[PDB]
Amino acid sequence: MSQSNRELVVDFLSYKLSQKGYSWSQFPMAAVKQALREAGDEFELRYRRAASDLTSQLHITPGTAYQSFEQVVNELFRDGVNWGRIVAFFSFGGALCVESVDKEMQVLVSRIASWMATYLNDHLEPWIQENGGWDTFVDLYG
Numbered sequence: 001m002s003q004s005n006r007e008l009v010v011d012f013l014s015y016k017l018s019q020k021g022y023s024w025s026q027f028p029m030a031a032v033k034q035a036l037r038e039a040g041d042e043f044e045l046r047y048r049r050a051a052s053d054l055t056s057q058l059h060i061t062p063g064t065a066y067q068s069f070e071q072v073v074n075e076l077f078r079d080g081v082n083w084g085r086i087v088a089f090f091s092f093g094g095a096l097c098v099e100s101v102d103k104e105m106q107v108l109v110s111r112i113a114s115w116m117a118t119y120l121n122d123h124l125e126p127w128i129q130e131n132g133g134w135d136t137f138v139d140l141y142g
Contacts, residue, residue, distance in 0.1 A: 002121055004029065008134075009093070009116045012036060013109070016094035022101050026110045031142065032134045039141045040091040043084075051092040060096060062108055069115045081127040083140060089124070090116070 011033045014024035019041075044050065051058075058064070058072045076085050076092070093116045100108040128134065 002125065005120050005125065006117045008033065008036065009090070009113060009120065012040065012090050013094060013097055013113060013116075016040065016091075017097060017101075020098055022098065026106070026113075028138075029134070031138055035138050035142045036087065036090065039087045040094060043087050043091050047088075051095045054092060055095055055099060058096070060100060060103075060105070060108065060112075062105065062111075064108075066115050066118060069112075070119060073119060077123070081124055083137065086124060086128070086137075087141070089119075 007029070010027055014027055015033075015037050017024045054072055054075060057075070058069065060069075073089060073092070076089055093112055096112050097109045100106060100112065128137075
């Protein structure tokens with residue numbers, strides 16, 4: 001039962017807000033929070049690939065339902081989960097947030113927050129657990 005997971009997400013979001021300098025106000029595990037902080041950060045300082053026919057294929061309005069988010073993300077794991085796709089999933093969630101704020105849609109970002117949780121838990125936590133849980137996440141990226 002993971003509120004454990006809710007939590008990753010918020011941090012990670014807050015953490016990717018603050019860095020691109022907006023506010024985060026609409027808000028062994030500390031190792032993980034960070035391992036993924038620099039996981040995500042690195043993924044983008046390298047990739048840049050965002051998100052984008054995802055953020056574009058998503059053109060998020062407050063009209064947007066979880067469903068349609070969900071599909072767009074499914075696009076990341078249309079060859080199954082792995083860590084790096086996991087990582088991109090957040091990085092992507094990060095990216096939405098900011099657009100929302102740039103859109104002057106700032107109310108959305110706690111929604112994005114939840115969607116990521118649901119998705120996380122519903123779709124991703126399975127394979128996470130099956131490959132030794134956020135721990136392996138740490139010796140990897142750790």
